[PDB]
Symmetry: D2
Subunit: 386 residues, 4 copies
């Protein structure tokens, strides 16, 4: 019954199950978790792998020798379990030095430090086998309009990502970058606030082929946007390098609920899209077990993430396989949407009286779309009520 | 006393001051305006020009004699007043035939009709002098997840815009296209919901140089986004072809308040940005005088749009000219933000011990950013307490 | 399979299935529906009854004779089907005379007219057997801060509802009032914007026992609030006289989706609460079949409303009946929440060292709440995956 | 030059200027402030007084010697400066023991401990001169629908507040309670989420005269609500015991910006309302200097709160005094709104043919409301263009 296996490619950040529960108005409720324990317990739950910020694995300010010992212990646990590390990222948001940003800090010396800290961890990520290096610019932005010249900040952002691309190209690394957009929190407004803005920015990088997006369910929903629609545009662009799964109740603080909570119908359509499109990347959960929970609740919440994905996968597959649903899709002309509008070309369209002078507007306007019957078939499938 | 004149390039849609007050819960409160009267009244208020949807000028279904008569009357008003027509657009949203979209309707015959209706109005727009042709895909989208395959819809949208670019290129027209993003309303979710999504889409068109964005204040605010930040990204990309100005109180239905209402501070930072950057396009008001108003109130509301822009322009200019503000900008290191992070190059950065091995993290972290003093100077200037 | 029956007390407004599809940016897509047809078709679907605004049943401006004929036809259809009319309301929002409100219009003559129009329809509602008279003040409010003195408007609101209470008391009618709060749309902000504000206002009426609330799913979700939580406070207060069911995707324009769409998990917890608490009033659907639909889609959407309520009722009943769920509720101490905190009294609490001086804060802080396991049992039940 | 003085009754929480900058994504950026220093600095800026949570003054877990020493130092600072303490509150949200609430924790022993912690601090508040005791139930609520039975929780909340009212009555204290509503954060949904819900709850307490509200600008705006409208309802009910002033950009995480930031127009209408109505309580700033700031920025931010209130007070006074505004208010019939609708009584209204049979609906509907001219006069005054 909806048991995950490592072939499902479910992954978790060390900082997810390891979140000690410190929140905007509260102290930690759980003791710290050894990454070695997280690797072992996630393996037992059926996960494929784990991910990390540099500072999750190596305490900030560690000597080279302490750093080697921390990585060695972690690698031993990976070797013992067969767990993978498909993605890594840099923490450029917790330390006070990054209070005005890393790559777009107004202070130039901070921008240079942020790049050096990142480059060091790209090397570590490559040693551990990561295929994707995520950048979440949580401190890039402003609370007030005068504090940040956004055109200059975008220049600095581009410069930073261009330098990082030069680094991985010069080193011959087979790792690619994924930009994680977020609209706000912790800054009043964050730069590159949605999947759209990030995709647009990537097209102006010197080596755009090296960069994609890492969209997160909750982040897009914090702007009230349709997450499956945004994922569709990322897939259409060839840029869905990674994805972050969790739950969110619309427009409020970043909740990081387990996947399936929040907007359940959006989670269904998301899984339908990922599976139909053949997305082959990690299904990464960037969530936080609520601080009400003890460690039994931590592992229950992590298990729930994977369970809900697998239930939704089954229901979406049943929906698509149902001949009654296929009939409803045809009745609603979803198949016709895939036909080119004018493969006959511009001149033929202009010459086609059936497209204007002889187009029966009122007859076309009278055609029902049959979308409600289609959506109720989807609801029936989601709820197992067919 | 903040009197607008045609040099200010303020423009209005016929459908703005001409809105009869119908809403989904309410019947019209004002009689219809003759476009000729709107042109004359707007000219008397100091406007530079007007804009139109095809259906605002030419009643839908008009014979070619009626269409000719309507255009001649409108042209005569333009000739009498000296009013310009810098922009036009197609109504692909009011008539029931467009209830599932124009360019991305599931029905192919509707997609072709939408293109032919647009092409006809591009010709008229060019005749009347428009430099920009706006596309607002208000019916492109869905209420339910199964109703629209967004990857197929993006293919159809690209095909449509590619054909339009072929048309203008083949005719030798100088006009360019501006895509108007909106996140929702009237569809549950609209395709290309933000400036970012539209900018990203444009980069995948066959002739991207022919396309930019027409962002609207209220649209981006309906997603909770920072409108000046989005305009900055459009300017950074070279894609701010046109702009729609109005007011909105954050995340709720599309209010179309007069410019300056809604988020007043955001309006200040917007005007500062447009004026600083040297934006030279129309300052177009896409707003609706509330239906509480008679026609005296319609013209007061239109005059208020321009008045508020001019007051804000003065305050932003005073802010930037103030020596105390120039000092505060230096204190907050806005000058450092404009400097390249690493013009010495990647290898020099990697070899620079001051950027990592010898970087004093705690000394850097102790530096205040002085953003609050800067913002209070901005507040003082906005409110005329400076 | 989830077939509704009239004993389920499902009701629909004439204006729901009869919505012709005119929306903020679009003309009607469907012809008008005869109320007699709506009564017959809703009866065939298993509905219990219908509801009406005065102007839905009797065209505004009808003579007494036309009014009698319209009501007679409608009553004949009710008599032929056994359908009931449990609720009625006044349209004080469509006609331009109400553009600044009915009961709180700034113009005093309009306020008096609004009351007379309402009183006439209370008489009709009583003739048709309505137990609840709903008041939705959709035009009560403002777009700008100077337009409406809210303290004076609340005085006028109270005066109006007090007069209506005097009327029903003097006539000896066994009908009660239900105030429908909404936060915005069509006004920029509406007076009494949530269930809370309406409950608070009712307590200051002269005859509070005559007044309750008619909360609507989407209305509370347009403020981002938790609809089941608000319903719980209404039930706690003894004030849930009626309820309006539909769907809404969080904070945007009022979508009026069919019940079950929008926030599906919130719909589950709502049905769980209504059924557990023993709510015995109508389950009224105030929804609009989307304008994409023909009349087959209208009736499908209406059927879907009832179907989704019944599926959710089954899943919530299964959840509560599951001994594993009951065990999880006890593990999370939901039963302990029902114990009085200090039925021993204030003095005993102050004297109880176990409540302060000997309270082991760290032992209590270490107790997990087990809420995630409980919520995953709820998810499993909702999706039929137990 | 808008200098605050103690006559203005501006107050600040120790936790405001004392916020060290920790957020869920970030470590502290400022060292801890001695409350004695905060009292002295706030006095130098012109503040009237300070407020505190128990835990801000007395480190949690302090012995009675340490508690005594801390209170004496604080009192000495109050005596030295003349600063008052008009309000105090209990911290029932930071410590992990409160992770499921204080008064509505599922565990009864926690509910009793929360009450005892509150009662102890009521005694201290009264000793230091507080007239208002605030309760912000930041942990009362849930992330999931099964975790909290809201009807039982409201019973427990009423029981707690009833006991507190018995305590103050039994001791003969003059202090009154003010409930601070908030819709979410740190819980997914908080109980009593808005001013309306809190006002409604108070009416069901045993001694309702002892309880009012402490609304906070940002809290109501986090639900998209109109804060001046909510304050008007609290004033109408006689329940505005205290008020918390800050800034917020609509629906997103709790930003706690300085007052005047966020929604500037709403701040103008708020100050107009408080001053017009003769509100005589503290003007309390519950804000956080952003973590980008050093201590010079902390004091600049605090000074800016008061400066912005005073500028707005001047502009609102100028608006109301302007003869042109008095004319515009008459043109918009704000005077008619203050007149009773039907002081002649129900029977006279029913018998008045001018209110119905002879009411000229279309003549009434033709009247403009002149709200746009009125609002532009308000804008002109706010911006000092008048």
């Amino acid at each position: 019954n909806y048991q995950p296996t490592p072939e499902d490619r479910f992954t978790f950040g060390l900082w997810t199950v390891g979140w000690q529960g410190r929140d905007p108005f509260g102290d930690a409720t759980r003791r710290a978790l050894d990454p070695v324990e997280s690797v072992r317990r996630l393996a037992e739950l059926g996960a494929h792998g784990v991910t990390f910020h540099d500072d999750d694995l190596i305490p900030f300010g560690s000597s080279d020798s302490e750093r080697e010992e921390h990585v060695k212990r972690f690698r031993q646990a990976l070797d013992d379990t067969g767990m993978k590390v498909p993605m890594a990222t840099t923490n450029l948001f917790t330390h006070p030095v990054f209070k005005d940003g890393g790559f777009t800090a107004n202070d130039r010396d901070v921008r240079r430090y942020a790049l050096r800290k990142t480059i060091r961890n790209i090397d570590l990520a490559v040693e551990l086998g990561a295929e994707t290096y995520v950048a979440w610019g949580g401190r890039e932005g402003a609370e007030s309009g005068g504090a940040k010249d956004v055109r200059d900040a975008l220049d600095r952002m581009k410069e930073a990502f261009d330098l990082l691309g030069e680094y991985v190209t010069s080193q011959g690394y087979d790792i690619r970058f994924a930009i994680e957009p977020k609209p706000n929190e912790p800054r009043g407004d964050i730069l590159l606030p949605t999947v759209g803005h990030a995709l647009a920015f990537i097209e102006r990088l010197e080596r755009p082929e090296l960069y994609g997006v890492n969209p997160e369910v909750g982040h897009e929903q914090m702007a009230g946007l349709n997450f499956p629609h945004g994922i569709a545009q990322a897939l259409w662009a060839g840029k869905l390098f990674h994805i972050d799964l969790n739950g969110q109740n619309g427009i409020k603080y970043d909740q990081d609920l387990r996947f399936g909570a929040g907007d359940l119908r959006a989670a269904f359509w998301l899984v339908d899209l990922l599976e139909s499109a053949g997305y082959s990347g990690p299904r990464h959960f960037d969530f936080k077990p609520p601080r009400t929970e003890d460690f039994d609740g931590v592992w229950a919440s992590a298990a729930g993430c994977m369970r809900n994905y697998l239930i939704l996968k089954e229901r979406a597959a049943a929906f698509r396989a149902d001949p009654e649903v296929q009939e409803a899709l045809r009745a609603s002309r979803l198949d016709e949407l895939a036909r080119p509008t004018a493969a006959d070309g511009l001149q033929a369209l202009l010459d086609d009286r059936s497209a204007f002078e002889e187009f029966d507007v009122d007859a076309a306007a009278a055609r029902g779309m049959a979308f409600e019957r289609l959506d109720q078939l989807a609801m029936d499938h989601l709820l197992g009520a067919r």
